[PDB]
Amino acid sequence: PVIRVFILTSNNPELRSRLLLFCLRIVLSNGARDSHRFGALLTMFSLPSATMLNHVKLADQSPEADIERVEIDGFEEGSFRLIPNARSGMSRGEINAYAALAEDLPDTLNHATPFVDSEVEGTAWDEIETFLDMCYSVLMQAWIVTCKEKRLQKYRQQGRINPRYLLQPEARRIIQNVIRKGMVVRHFLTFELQLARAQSLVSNRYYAMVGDVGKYIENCGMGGFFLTLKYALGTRWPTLALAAFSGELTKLKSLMALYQTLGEQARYLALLESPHLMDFAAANYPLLYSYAMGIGYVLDVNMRNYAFSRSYMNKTYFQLGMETARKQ
């Protein structure tokens, strides 16, 4: 059906906070449909992004609907009633339905709140720093679960995600499964990852954290491919002229030409669930992958942690690889 993305007419931090928490509750509600969660989640990710806001366009055959503008929410908390403007096209029945979804949290959430701290939603969202700290903290928790263990303890210790706005584990898992089911959501996340990579926002604290998370997301499932290119092939080893490599060498030539052809889709094959992702799996070139692991076993200090029981691991071309890089 319709994917509803609400956006505001005001830079009011308290309104930006209420829309955030309203949308968070719709993603986590029992009764919402997938289309409601996808749009409520894209609204959250769009609040600190001017770019995603310009990407959500109804013009060209939209499954997306801006719903157009939302002035404010109902003033008394517990009234998650939206106030849209003229030319909005939202009927009262839908404002009550949305207000009812925001109160329909599962019982696994202590104190009927998505947060570990039961007094977070009750905070007065007066200043933009209180919102931006809250907005960045929960959005960061959604970025870690987008990926394919406890990096929360890392991100808490280092550049901030505020422990005050930690989500309860049940809220994180629900967000994780919505992002997995939502192809439309992950399609817009790539534009954020692309923007964090090409940085006119080096000083922006949010895109700096997105770019670090993006290091783990980008080229996920491509490790075996890039390690093979690095070791088996980064130098002209004379053992490359073995006839047993002749087939896999042309295979990697097509695989590398494939990476160039796809352009920027190549960085997000696992995130977009592209069928081409498996084409880069080491099982399509097990001899060279075996030859490259042996080279990197003796050349690099860090490859103690990676070589862990692969089924197609040859273990004979592994010994050929280490002996080739043994002496230079």
């Binding site: 990579r197 290091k215 783990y216 980008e218 080229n219 491509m222 890039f226 290119l229 690095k230 092939l233 980064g234 130098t235 002209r236 490359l240 002229a241 060498l249 042309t250 990697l252 030539k253 590398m256 030409a257 990476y259 160039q260």
Partner: peptide
């Protein structure tokens, strides 16, 4: 762990001179 861009890891199609 992960690889940055600057995928200079395309020195290898010339590394395919043995073809």
């Amino acid at each position: 762990l992960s690889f940055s861009p600057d995928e200079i890891n395309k020195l290898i199609e010339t590394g395919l001179n043995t073809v």
